[PDB]
Amino acid sequence: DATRISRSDFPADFIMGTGSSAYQIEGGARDGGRGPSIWDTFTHRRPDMIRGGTNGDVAVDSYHLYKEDVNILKNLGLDAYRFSISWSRVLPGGRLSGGVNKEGINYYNNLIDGLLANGIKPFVTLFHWDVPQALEDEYGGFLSPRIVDDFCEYAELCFWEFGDRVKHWMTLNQPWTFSVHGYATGLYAPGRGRSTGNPGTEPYWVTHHLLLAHAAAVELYKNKFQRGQEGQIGISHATQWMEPWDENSASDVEAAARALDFMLGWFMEPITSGDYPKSMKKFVGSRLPKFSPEQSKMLKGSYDFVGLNYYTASYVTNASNFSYNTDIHVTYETDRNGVPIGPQSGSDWLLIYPEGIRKILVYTKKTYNVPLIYVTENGVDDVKNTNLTLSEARKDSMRLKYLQDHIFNVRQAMNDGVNVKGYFAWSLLDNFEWGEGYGVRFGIIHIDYNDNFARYPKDSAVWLMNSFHK
Amino acid sequence: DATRISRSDFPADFIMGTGSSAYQIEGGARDGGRGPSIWDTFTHRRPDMIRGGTNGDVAVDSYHLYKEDVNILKNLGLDAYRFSISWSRVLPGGRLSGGVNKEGINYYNNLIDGLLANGIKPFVTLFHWDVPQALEDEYGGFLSPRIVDDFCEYAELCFWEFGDRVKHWMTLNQPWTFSVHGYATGLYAPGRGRSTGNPGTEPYWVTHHLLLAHAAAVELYKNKFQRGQEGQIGISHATQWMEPWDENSASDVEAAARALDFMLGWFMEPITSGDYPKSMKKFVGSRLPKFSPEQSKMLKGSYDFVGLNYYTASYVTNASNFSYNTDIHVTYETDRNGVPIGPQSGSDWLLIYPEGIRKILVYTKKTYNVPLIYVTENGVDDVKNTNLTLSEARKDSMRLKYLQDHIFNVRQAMNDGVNVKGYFAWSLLDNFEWGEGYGVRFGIIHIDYNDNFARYPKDSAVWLMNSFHK
Amino acid sequence: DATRISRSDFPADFIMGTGSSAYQIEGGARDGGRGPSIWDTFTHRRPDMIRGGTNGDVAVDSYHLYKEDVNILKNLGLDAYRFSISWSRVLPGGRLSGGVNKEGINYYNNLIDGLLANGIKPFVTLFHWDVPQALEDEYGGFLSPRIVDDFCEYAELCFWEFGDRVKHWMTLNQPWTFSVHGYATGLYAPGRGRSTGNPGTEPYWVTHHLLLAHAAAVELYKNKFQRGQEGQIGISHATQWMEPWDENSASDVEAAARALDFMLGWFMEPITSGDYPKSMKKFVGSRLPKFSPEQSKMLKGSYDFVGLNYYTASYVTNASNFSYNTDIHVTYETDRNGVPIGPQSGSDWLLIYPEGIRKILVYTKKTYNVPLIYVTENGVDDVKNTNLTLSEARKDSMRLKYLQDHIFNVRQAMNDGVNVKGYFAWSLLDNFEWGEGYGVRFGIIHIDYNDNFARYPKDSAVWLMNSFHK
Ligand SMILES: C=C[C@H]1[C@H](O[C@@H]2O[C@H](CO)[C@@H](O)[C@H](O)[C@H]2O)OC=C(C(=O)OC)[C@H]1CC=O
Ligand SMILES: C=C[C@H]1[C@H](O[C@@H]2O[C@H](CO)[C@@H](O)[C@H](O)[C@H]2O)OC=C(C(=O)OC)[C@H]1CC=O
Ligand SMILES: C=C[C@H]1[C@H](O[C@@H]2O[C@H](CO)[C@@H](O)[C@H](O)[C@H]2O)OC=C(C(=O)OC)[C@H]1CC=O
Ligand SMILES: [Cl-]
Ligand SMILES: [Cl-]
Ligand SMILES: [Cl-]
């Protein structure tokens, strides 16, 4: 049973942790010499696109309050903390000739030594959507294949400055979301595809360039750093469990496999076999870029581990100019007869379905044969409500149950044979939630926006410490 | 023509300034030894009563940023600035035995010296609704008449500490509003009037205690300080022009004059002749307290100048257990025959009626025969809109026009023989707006809540500087 | 005689001074939150275009050493100092929504109070080529007419922050050089015209937009600031004396008038009469933009004074796809029979011809009828020589004679009837000289690049103090 799950149900080397990303927590957007990212410009030029018209200029101020975040982490007692570096903080002009920012480097070094002083292992992500405005403006950012070399320079700086203490790297986090909402729906930065954007072509190019940036950085680590620093490198993917609306309709079963193909296979097959998935070549056809054979050779097996981010699940059925959305030829169902696949969380797109994580995990292992997996993101948001006082606000039973059920399911997946090495809840703190602004709370630590972002643990944090301390 | 109005249309001694109140701008609610006010407890225990569930903990942080505000005021170039002292900042327990807070005193001395170093005269208000919670919890704040002595100790403290530099004092600002929304409607702190409250009685006791508090303090200043410090003391009243729905119906001319009595007369009659107005005694009867004759003797003439606050206007006509609102026996109407008395501003209760200020001014001199008047508040809010970028947000055309029109009308009232010595715009900064939270913007200085409350002047400020500098 | 010229040869109100521009002296390119200008990017991306491949990242560090520069200015004893603000220092994203940089504002306030503490009048230039990279990248900077509104926002900030102490403003300095070398020759930033650039069209558009930016800012000052702040506003133009190769050839005489038309008339006629000069309409024809009539009304008489920058002179004769260079249809001669118009300075393009300044001054007064003139730039560079020790290096007799002869000629122009109100030597310090890097020294104060930019006065500085002190 789930409510009894605890650290002793897992192997000794298993790792528990929490996470954040730079733009959602740091603030200090124009402090310590940081240059602007595309999220800075998007939130400031297109405030109508953000709930409340807000931005992450200050966010929850971890730039200044990191000593406090570290204390929280020490009190929480878990093994590891996942965070990302802001590219334009260390390189404000995105490329080397734009200047190297010592002060931004000093910030991450302080954060990292702080965590190590306290027995907390840092897991570091190079990239979480925050493309330096300078590169976006000079050559369209990830639209251009120039992005691959600049990203490499960026990565080499990080390995050089931090790699003596950081032993666990990830190139990208959730590239799917960046591609799709950046270039297909236009809801996220840079906000294209609603020249001006083409949901039919751009997403495929962006993704193509993401994968090459990732493979080049991995080759760079492996050939120039791994032997001296002895770390490991990988990548983190968005996933959603895709379930056949009708378990009988072989048509529905294939729609579900195709949906997986277009979300996770899009990224996973290239680093497994060096190529896009069959179904995408078929349905996308000539709008889908091709890898030179030496590229395929670089991509193939370009990782030491893979992380999966899981939130929700869905029923899939077949569908009946172009765009990524329509190329998939599926339709999404939440109800199987006015019977929802699971209950709503605070967000109407997030339906709670614990077994989804067990299935995605088993599927990933079987389909792609990954030797080593971490769950790098998993969590839920509180029902919105500005009426509660802190004693009420902090009682987050839904999240508490959500975490138990999902962690229990991760344990199942390991019995099923999947080599899962760790699990990170998302997120540490309530923070900036992109298009949703500050209205949506994902943190195990509450934040009081009315009082300098005072931090206070929620019952889930207390529970994680008690059940998983070490 | 209003758009041409400028300093040279006024006598040389005429004073121009802006204003704030402590709880709306300061923040530092628990910093530097401040104790809690009733507004602190209200917003924190009843967040459902505030748009957004927000409070004044940080507000716009003038507590830490007061140097910038002073620099803004120097650039603005007007003669004077009107602010209030937070009672529970200088005396955290409200009464002397609660402790005298040196840091609180030091803050105001720093503020006052900065203003004077820059040639800006301070006009200081002892009280603006922020009753120390300790006095509220010990004896019901302004319900009890103990409040009069405590208020007196508070006042003496301020005169002794600051009276060498501050030469213009006001005991209270907007007491009407405190009484009515505090104890009749129960929308503002302490939030009483559905013991749990009683809109039939408490409002009248509260007003009774407010006036005795004001009179005690004026006797104190006048007997013990005035000769040595040579300052002046006064008080500041809420006003709203009241127009007879039908200029003819001599019964409407009556509903109007009765609406005046119940708003402005309720406070001005006592300091004029020592008693409440007839209309009020008749309709309220025995629920309305009496003044001992020594009290009447103390109240009568208790001021060196009066300040009027004016925002809007209304049509009044006659009406059809007990409650202040029903005791008035009037109904308010916004239009004659589908025509609004004036256009809306960002706020639906605020209709723009420049002529009301001329009228209110003339009425006041005529009915109560005040020899010296200041307009202590007058301003309007922006239309809410989180979609605008700063260069759009700062074009505050409506405010600019509103200021010009009201200032023009004040100038007319002077031609009519009313002796006005100055006018203060409300308010200097966008800030906390009580039940409205941060959603409503009254500042001539824009405030960016996403980025540490960055301040930036609106066109109204630039126009004030250019048209009234000296 | 020239060598005897001194302050007593001039009227009492006459003003003497020195000058610099932001990018040439400040450094601190990425300090205190400054954003990049087009000169940052040009020098860093195209180092081959700068002698030595250097840039102004540190320059002569006046950002950090300004207290020392102020001491020098105090020792030098002249009335005034001319400097420019770095647009992207106060607005790092060029437009308001890119963030207002308090720290950059604080720097100029410190500089300005420093100068005022010492009896030195500040003359301030809004713009000296340093276009914020953000605006160049978003919409092509001065190619787009969007530049006019952003430039206005920028100007309003400056007037608001500094206008209480700065009483003498200039919108642009040397716009000619910016247009021509930015867009016709491509030698300076942004380096176009060698899409990709069109020397035939772009220079004319850039210039057109410069003039509108200037006229809008002047309208802004005059309508919204001048009455409260009581300052004055103007602009500074490049000039070169143009002399008929053959004093007889009426053909040569017209070539000279046409050359003046294309250098100085290009800017001067629009603010005099509201239109470009006749000769340019003729030779440029339909490639020359046109002013709407309300634009002409804005431009006409848009200045309180004009400053002229004079360095050298030339002989002009007639010439025999498109480009600004060829549109002029003149040829430049330095020799009148192997007899050079004047001797070389350290730069082969700079030929010393003192009477040139007297003629340009008289010509400007007669042709355009300007009531009030300042010479805002005038000076010469030392022969390059890295072999001299400081005692030798500082003996700058050529500059000393250059200054005497030119100042003498300014005095002549005033006898000739021109109302000249002041004269500023260029420059205060040796500094970054654009395409020439650090190899070229224009300062009256020597700089030691080998030793933290130690400052040391040259004989010319000593002479100016002695002869013009006050
Ligand atoms: C909405 C954003 C992403 C989400 O991106 C994550 O959202 C979190 C909450 O806003 C963020 O805190 C986090 O940065 C991001 O990984 O990742 C998962 C999604 C999903 O549908 O499940 C598969 C997407 C939501 C779908 O509409
Ligand atoms: C709503 C608050 C007060 C208002 O009180 C002022 O409100 C400002 C805006 O919220 C405040 O910033 C300020 O503290 C206060 O003086 O003063 C005038 C009112 C009126 O009806 O016209 C006479 C009241 C509004 C009536 O419903
Ligand atoms: C070379 C740059 C400009 C020069 O620009 C000035 O050059 C100085 C020396 O490099 C600079 O310090 C200064 O910024 C600038 O005003 O202004 C005058 C020129 C001229 O030919 O005389 C009319 C130009 C030189 C001609 O080739
Ligand atoms: Cl580079
Ligand atoms: Cl006491
Ligand atoms: Cl803007």
Side-chain angles (χ1 to χ4, degrees), chain C residues 21 24 82 128-129 173-174 176-177 181 188 238-241 263 309-313 349-350 377 426-427 431-434 436 440 442:
Chain C
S21 84
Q24 308 185 262
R82 201 187 124 251
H128 201 294
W129 315 346
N173 186 232
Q174 285 218 331
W176 181 85
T177 312
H181 288 288
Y188 282 6
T239 75
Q240 179 185 322
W241 184 246
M263 187 175 66
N309 314 331
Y310 174 98
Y311 292 90
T312 191
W349 62 263
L350 200 169
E377 290 196 11
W426 177 271
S427 49
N431 48 38
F432 182 70
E433 290 294 348
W434 308 118
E436 297 283 39
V440 170
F442 266 85

Side-chain angles (χ1 to χ4, degrees), chain C residues 13 42 120 145 211:
Chain C
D13 57 359
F42 185 65
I120 301 159
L211 286 165

Side-chain angles (χ1 to χ4, degrees), chain B residues 24 128 174 188 239-240 311-312 349 377 426 433-434 442:
Chain B
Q24 294 178 268
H128 198 298
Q174 294 265 308
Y188 285 4
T239 82
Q240 184 191 244
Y311 291 91
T312 190
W349 60 262
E377 286 188 23
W426 180 268
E433 291 289 355
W434 306 122
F442 272 88

Side-chain angles (χ1 to χ4, degrees), chain B residues 6 8 68 71-72 74-76 389-391 394 455-457 459 462 465-466 469, chain C residues 95-97 100 102 109 153 156-157 160-161 164-165 223-229:
Chain B
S6 84
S8 48
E68 223 191 307
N71 187 239
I72 284 141
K74 177 263 308 184
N75 290 339
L76 185 52
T389 64
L390 178 57
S391 36
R394 56 179 309 266
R455 278 88 161 123
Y456 203 90
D459 295 336
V462 181
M465 185 282 284
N466 203 48
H469 186 292
Chain C
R95 44 189 288 216
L96 286 188
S97 64
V100 180
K102 291 304 156 182
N109 263 326
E153 295 300 5
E156 179 159 14
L157 180 59
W160 167 254
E161 302 288 4
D164 64 314
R165 291 95 78 218
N223 289 339
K224 299 195 182 173
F225 281 100
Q226 186 153 56
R227 186 209 189 118
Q229 294 182 352

